[PDB]
């Protein structure tokens, strides 16, 4: 049923000529996002994937001890909408990269993104200031769907302008060591690429819509590291922004990276279909 495989996932975590398109869920998020995320299948008889628990925000199993001391937060004292060079939070980000529509400026370096520090609850500014985008949550109309060749994937139902926040990679925050012994590694996302005390998000047991975004070698999304309610640099949050105009109906994709394909390429090849595919 709707819950049978969700429960099973929760308990495993605790222990450790085509068909007419069918709507298999009106909302995979069960009302937890600002808009529904429907699930459809125009390919076969498979029900909506349910062997995970949908969560809209990161969770933990074993404790992570994120620094949440409010007095440690850098904040701004702006009397405007945080559009000026006087904003501390923009300075921490190099500049505020968001235009008035909430979209990344053309100058934003998508090949080597900076860290973004959004305004927070210690700032003097108001909740509607310019430097608040990822913290406003999923806005775009997305859909989980059955692909022909690549299991489930995510599409946009509407045009998404370049530089728009699409969704966050959400899941269970775990250590590098715990990640190294997870039986299913397909949903792991490293928070930092260096050696030492580094952390991961595992979206296998707990995740959001982003867990179904397939890899693409010429991707329409780029992940960016973002700080909002805390500034513990061990725990950036992963926000996907569009790299170009994404047309209504288009599948979302991002570049999983070499730390994925170094392992998985030994088992199967990329089928993204790009003329510039780097993993087939």
């Amino acid at each position: 049923g709707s819950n049978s495989q969700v429960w099973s996932a929760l308990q495993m975590s605790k222990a450790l000529p085509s068909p007419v398109e069918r709507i298999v869920s009106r909302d995979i998020a069960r009302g937890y996002e600002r808009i529904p995320i429907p699930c459809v299948n125009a390919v076969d008889s498979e029900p909506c994937p349910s062997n995970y628990k949908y969560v809209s925000q990161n969770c933990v199993t074993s404790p992570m001890n994120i620094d949440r001391n409010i007095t440690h937060l850098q904040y701004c004292v702006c009397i405007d909408d945080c559009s000026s060079s006087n904003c501390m939070c923009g300075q921490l980000s190099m500049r505020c990269w968001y235009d008035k529509d909430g979209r990344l400026l053309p100058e934003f370096n998508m090949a080597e993104p900076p860290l973004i520090f959004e305004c927070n609850h210690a700032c003097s500014c108001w909740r509607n200031c310019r430097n608040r985008v990822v913290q406003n949550g999923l806005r775009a109309r997305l859909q989980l769907y059955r692909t022909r060749d690549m299991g489930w994937g995510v599409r946009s139902l509407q045009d998404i302008p370049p530089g728009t926040f699409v969704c966050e990679y959400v899941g269970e925050l775990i250590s590098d060591s715990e990640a190294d012994v997870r039986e299913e590694d397909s949903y792991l996302f490293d928070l930092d690429n260096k050696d030492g005390e580094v952390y991961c998000i595992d979206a296998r047991f707990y995740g959001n819509v982003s867990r179904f975004i397939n890899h693409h070698c010429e991707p329409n999304l780029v992940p960016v590291r973002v700080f909002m309610a805390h500034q513990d640099l061990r725990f950036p949050r992963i926000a996907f922004f569009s790299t170009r105009l994404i047309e209504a109906g288009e599948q979302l994709g991002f570049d999983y990276g070499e730390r994925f394909w170094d392992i998985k390429g030994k088992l199967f090849s990329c089928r993204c279909g790009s003329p510039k595919c780097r993993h087939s």
Binding site: P113, Y169, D180, V181, D185, F189, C200, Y256, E258
Partner: peptide
């Protein structure tokens, strides 16, 4: 590493 990891 022992397991696959997506990355930024």
């Amino acid at each position: 590493k022992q397991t696959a990891r997506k990355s930024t």
